[PDB]
Amino acid sequence: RKRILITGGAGFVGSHLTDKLMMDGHEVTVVDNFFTGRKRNVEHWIGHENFELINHDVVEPLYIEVDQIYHLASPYNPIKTLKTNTIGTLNMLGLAKRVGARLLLASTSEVYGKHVAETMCYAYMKQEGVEVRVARIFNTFGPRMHMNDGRVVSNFILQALQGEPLTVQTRAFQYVSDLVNGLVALMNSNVSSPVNLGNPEEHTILEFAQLIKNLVGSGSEIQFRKPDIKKAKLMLGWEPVVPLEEGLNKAIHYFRKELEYQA
Amino acid sequence: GGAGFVGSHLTDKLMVDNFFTGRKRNVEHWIINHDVVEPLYIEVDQYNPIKTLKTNTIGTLNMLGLAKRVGVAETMCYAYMKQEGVETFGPRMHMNDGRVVSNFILQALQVSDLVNGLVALMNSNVSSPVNLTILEFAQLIKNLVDIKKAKLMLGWEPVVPLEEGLNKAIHYFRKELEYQA
Amino acid sequence: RILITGGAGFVGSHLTDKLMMDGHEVTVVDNFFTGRKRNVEHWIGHENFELINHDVVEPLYIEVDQIYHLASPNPIKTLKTNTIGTLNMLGLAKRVGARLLLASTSVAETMCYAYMKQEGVEVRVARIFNTFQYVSDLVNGLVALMNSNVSSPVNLDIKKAKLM
Amino acid sequence: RKRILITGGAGFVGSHLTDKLMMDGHEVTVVDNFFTGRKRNVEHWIGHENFELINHDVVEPLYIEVDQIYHLASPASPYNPIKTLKTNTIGTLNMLGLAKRVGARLLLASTSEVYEGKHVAETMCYAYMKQEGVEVRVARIFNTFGPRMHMNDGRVVSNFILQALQGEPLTVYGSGSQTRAFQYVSDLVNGLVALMNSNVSSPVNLGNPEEHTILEFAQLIKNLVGSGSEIQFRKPDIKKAKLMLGWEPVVPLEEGLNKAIHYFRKELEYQA
Amino acid sequence: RKRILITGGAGFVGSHLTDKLMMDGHEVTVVDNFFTGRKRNVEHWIGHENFELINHDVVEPLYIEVDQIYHLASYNPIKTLKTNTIGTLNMLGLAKRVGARLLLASTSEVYGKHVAETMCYAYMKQEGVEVRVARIFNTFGPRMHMNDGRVVSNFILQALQGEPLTVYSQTRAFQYVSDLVNGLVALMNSNVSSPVNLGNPEEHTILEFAQLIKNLVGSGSEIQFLRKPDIKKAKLMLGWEPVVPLEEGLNKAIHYFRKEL
Amino acid sequence: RKRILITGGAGFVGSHLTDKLMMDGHEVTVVDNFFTGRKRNVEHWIGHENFELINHDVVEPLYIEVDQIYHLASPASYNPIKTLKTNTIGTLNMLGLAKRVGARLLLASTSEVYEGKHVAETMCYAYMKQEGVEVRVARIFNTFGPRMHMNDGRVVSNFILQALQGEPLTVYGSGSQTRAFQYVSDLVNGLVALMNSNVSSPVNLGNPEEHTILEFAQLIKNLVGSGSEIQFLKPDIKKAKLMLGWEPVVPLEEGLNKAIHYFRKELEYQA
Ligand SMILES: NC(=O)c1ccc[n+]([C@@H]2O[C@H](COP(=O)([O-])OP(=O)(O)OC[C@H]3O[C@@H](n4cnc5c(N)ncnc54)[C@H](O)[C@@H]3O)[C@@H](O)[C@H]2O)c1
């Protein structure tokens, strides 16, 4: 069992990763500045002997002894984002260099500051021999996700839950636990080249509208880049195993829980 | 300290926090992550005991070092005054604090007047300190499920009755417990 | 290895002598705000003594075994000394595993029991009374209280000190 | 007349830019860490009342009162990727912060290679413009040659001048049908000053659209040098600069090559 | 009347200087880390509206708004060098910043206080800092250091104790302190940039001093064996000269030593 | 073989030292802020595995792990305040470094102690006495050779310049005053000898062989092959000779020729 640091672990993906790593009995250190993260996503672990929550900004230098580093800190405010993606990543690479820790960069499918984040990691690998991992994350959904990210899956759930009409090409979405398995898979693998972590199983916009409507139980009216993971299938033995129905239900539950709290 | 219980209701009426015991949801309808232990520079007009003690002392020292710059914590206020010329239940409250009233509500389910009193003492010239049955609470919560100095120097008094105050608090407690499921 | 903050003072300097007579590596930290360097100058030069011009509100990084924190003197500087200065010695204590004795009177106490409960700092709190009690006996009491096992407060009603 | 700061001003382009701004009577300050720049490139201005040379790294914060900022600070690649990346990102952020703090206009010297860190460098300038209202300018610079240029930059024009001067055979990869577009530095320098004082905050290509085949450069340089050397075996679109700035390369190739050949020859003789 | 900073103003020369400037109704400020100075030397003034004491090391940057800076701050060799170099750099830095006239208290052993001189003239030449350099000669009087080891202290100590005056024919000249202070203020408020000798041009041999002090102490003590100050420049520019006879001087100094012991 | 730090190693003396120590197979680190030094004087070693160049100012604290420290970082003569700070704060720092990492420090002082070089020596002995730092002090006399500052107002530099440029060789007085000059490789050998010796007291490193001003003028005139017109207007190394067994071995004509070559190459570059 290892000492793991998770930047942005108080967010959507980070908190779910935090759950799994705590379950495996690791010393998880979460660093978050709560810009888009919430203390609530990890508050169940506050007090636990192997967990620690630090209100810290990755733009500011951080000095801790850890074994692994999941760098997931990246949020409207373009300057703060650019500084986080660059100065923040440089710092985590500096920290991994100083304490001899492995760093996984949570990059994005949008690379087809995140682009230069990949490069910075490879700059430290090529030059300072820092063990790096680069995951190219595609569209991900689930509990604790940002409800108003304007994305097509979130809108349909919201509109369905409030009885509003569902206002309406293919979309690929993966459940968050799939991604979390993928990150952990990649982290402990020996693949240092970039790896696509997304769900290649696509569905049309209308198909999601019709599926979510049924799963919610609403009387709402309907008005008027596919991820290739053959590398992950082969190098990691990884693929999404959580069915669309099971994942959507857990997410619908979370949204439902949140909307009732705002009344 | 405005991301808290009294902090949020005081922010509300008038329209910096590390979210240690505060939450963003308490003020997010108006949208700095700063620990008051660290020196803060902005131009204005008006469980873990170590962190609590460092906050109340080093923190209050800063705000007095800020107040002085831009024009036991009680004693530090009067030290700055003399030397440097420097001048409860409700929603969003801590449920698991251990308070008698709070405990009864949790077992049964299973503040604006303070905001006025802070404002009234603030815009007044009184720097001197000013103050702002068990069964009957139990039987009332079950159904629904000395300030004389503030009366002469301020003319302020609590005007919200007891039942108006508990029901508004009960609503909040219920809302939270459903969220925990 | 013993560190005495405010050891160029009334009590600190008699405390300084007694500990230098027993041959401990005394280090006196002081800012001379109220303490006179004459009080301890007769020790300057010897191998065991060291005098450091230092204000406790500024962090102090030294390596000692015991800390006789007696630093206490303009009301604002007095409050920064009692609060921050104490937080800096408990931080020094916690950092170098030093046993700390507070010199309370008949807030800093609370910090001292905070660091014991939370960070496991060995602390000693002496509620000192009016001294001119004679100073030689107070040193006897402070030195006795440091090398004992009583964490709680002890007056120097001395029913507790006499029996413990 | 203005107070101008030039980061990387001790290098190839920056020093030529420095010459021009000094001649125009400005208070030019050069900030450089001499990682690839040379003090000789600007030593002629040292002592002059309007010039100041600072040994500074743009990765470290800098606080000086200026009106305009020419951000040319970026090492070249023949090397040290971490320092390059840190310079292009933390360096730019430092200068954008300065420009915001003192109300200064910043021209970023970007590159044609964006068609690393130069890309995210552009984005940061616009982030500051959009959010902090900082006046920014972005030049996308194409291949530039001339005096004070790095001779071993692996570039095709540098190699031909070198091999010709040493009587070595001029090596041509392939059939030499590939085309290369090169601008003299005083042209680029002219584009940069124009762009700075214009009101075009969108990226502007500064390059020489006049192309020539590899074989054409080989033979021209061969003749201009006067050697018995043997021959062995992204085009800049600048209509935006031509229209918004009234700028175009006006220095003929021959005049520019003679001057570059001179610099190389003077340097090679000093290394003997 | 001006805002005067005096570094080392709690020392021997420093403190008598603080006495005059305070008596003249100035706003004096002492910055001192107490390395070889004592609070009782200036305790007389603490609490006064125009006096302020600061326990401060000049090796650490200082930022106060003063008009004139008397830089007198100066066993432990490394700390002394740091104090005399960095310390002086800081006060010259301070003076450049708040436009103050700095007077350096240099010594006659210049014939690193030499470099402190050279720094003051580079800040004058290059940054336009008004500077005053006093080359100070051997001084004695009240509040002087009994155990410093100089020929005059040992000859009062050993006289007063009854111990033999230890003598190692060569000549020394000594001025009284109230005379060095009068000439320090006179140099500050003058227009002389170049260094000016502050001393007493009356040499006495080493053995002469030992028998002299004896007849002043009047104790049963025996004797057992084992750069002349030119002040003409200070005369004509400053109108300053030692006015205190040696005899009266040594008496006042013995009265300090005898009271202490 | 040791890890050696050379401050100011991009200067005249420093780069020639750097060459020698790199040839001897040491791990040489050059620290310089290029205020009077030039990267070209050392660039041939950049890329080599045992060489590292750091653009650093010794007035700023430096933390490196080394065995020996050659402290040559001091500008030549303009800006007095920066010279003063480098010689004092710069030295305090390099001694502070030496104390922290246990390194032997050689200070390059000057014969002018017969500015800031005097007090630089004292600081070294303060650290030796108080902090047990192993220190060495070389009192360097006038040195000439390739890579030297040409416009240092020095009598030999001026004579080569004026001769190379066909200008008249101006000689003040009758030119009967005498000057002693050493070639740089001689000075370097002395420095390495002084560094690896056990002599911690100051040691003069100079060429005791003196010549009159007019003698240098006429020799330099002849060695250049110029038609320049002539117009009109001491190092004691016996301790170095005995303790280190060192003495200058490079003849004057040989040293002057190599120096004349350097000046000549430089003036042509200034065309
Ligand atoms: N969410 C997706 O579907 C998706 C898609 C592609 C890529 N990704 C990648 O996955 C990672 C996790 O994203 P998410 O969807 O959980 O977003 P999120 O906002 O839930 O997670 C970001 C977390 O980082 C923290 N943070 C941001 N800036 C910080 C700073 N300067 N200092 C300290 N903490 C800071 C925030 O407070 C938040 O807790 C992201 O980095 C993103 O690039 C996510």
Ligand SMILES: NC(=O)c1ccc[n+]([C@@H]2O[C@H](COP(=O)([O-])OP(=O)(O)OC[C@H]3O[C@@H](n4cnc5c(N)ncnc54)[C@H](O)[C@@H]3O)[C@@H](O)[C@H]2O)c1
């Ligand atoms: N509510 C009551 O009945 C009551 C009773 C007695 C005293 N008080 C006083 O009234 C004040 C209001 O209490 P509340 O009910 O709003 O508590 P709260 O916990 O809701 O709010 C306190 C806020 O201060 C912030 N904070 C704490 N330590 C900090 C630090 N070191 N740096 C930055 N921010 C920090 C927390 O994040 C929190 O938001 C409290 O300070 C307390 O001292 C309240």
Ligand SMILES: NC(=O)c1ccc[n+]([C@@H]2O[C@H](COP(=O)([O-])OP(=O)(O)OC[C@H]3O[C@@H](n4cnc5c(N)ncnc54)[C@H](O)[C@@H]3O)[C@@H](O)[C@H]2O)c1
């Ligand atoms: N008998 C009494 O006089 C009496 C009565 C009640 C309480 N006490 C307590 O006993 C303790 C000893 O008191 P004392 O009379 O010996 O004190 P004192 O005033 O004689 O000595 C206090 C010492 O602390 C030093 N000091 C003050 N502030 C400092 C700072 N910020 N940093 C470093 N040094 C600093 C002073 O220079 C002085 O040497 C005190 O802490 C006081 O609270 C004493």
Ligand SMILES: NC(=O)c1ccc[n+]([C@@H]2O[C@H](COP(=O)([O-])OP(=O)(O)OC[C@H]3O[C@@H](n4cnc5c(N)ncnc54)[C@H](O)[C@@H]3O)[C@@H](O)[C@H]2O)c1
């Ligand atoms: N010259 C070309 O052909 C060409 C082509 C495309 C783009 N550009 C752009 O033009 C700009 C200037 O190019 P150049 O050929 O003059 O480059 P150059 O390599 O000759 O000079 C860059 C200058 O900046 C200095 N510098 C480097 N890193 C620094 C740091 N971290 N802090 C402070 N100073 C630093 C270097 O020493 C050098 O003087 C570059 O940014 C380059 O991207 C040039």
Ligand SMILES: NC(=O)c1ccc[n+]([C@@H]2O[C@H](COP(=O)([O-])OP(=O)(O)OC[C@H]3O[C@@H](n4cnc5c(N)ncnc54)[C@H](O)[C@@H]3O)[C@@H](O)[C@H]2O)c1
């Ligand atoms: N009086 C003489 O015999 C004599 C003779 C020649 C020269 N001088 C010069 O006159 C000046 C005054 O001498 P003095 O006899 O008063 O000496 P002194 O030792 O009595 O005075 C020195 C004062 O400087 C202070 N000091 C020392 N280091 C300090 C630091 N780092 N920061 C702040 N304060 C510091 C000490 O606390 C002390 O008060 C000295 O500079 C000395 O060089 C004196």
Ligand SMILES: NC(=O)c1ccc[n+]([C@@H]2O[C@H](COP(=O)([O-])OP(=O)(O)OC[C@H]3O[C@@H](n4cnc5c(N)ncnc54)[C@H](O)[C@@H]3O)[C@@H](O)[C@H]2O)c1
């Ligand atoms: N050659 C001589 O004639 C001679 C005579 C007497 C003494 N010396 C001494 O020999 C040493 C070498 O002198 P030189 O002739 O090589 O002169 P130089 O000017 O060529 O060497 C000084 C070197 O130190 C560097 N430097 C200056 N300030 C610095 C700082 N703050 N940080 C880092 N580097 C800095 C300069 O860039 C330069 O490379 C000097 O200490 C000088 O005092 C030389």
Ligand SMILES: O=c1ccn([C@@H]2O[C@H](COP(=O)(O)OP(=O)(O)O)[C@@H](O)[C@H]2O)c(=O)[nH]1
């Ligand atoms: O005059 C200045 C002001 C800013 N900075 C640097 O530029 C960075 C970015 O500035 P910004 O305003 O974005 O950051 P902030 O000061 O608000 O934290 C800062 O970290 C500073 O280090 C600078 O070099 N010169």
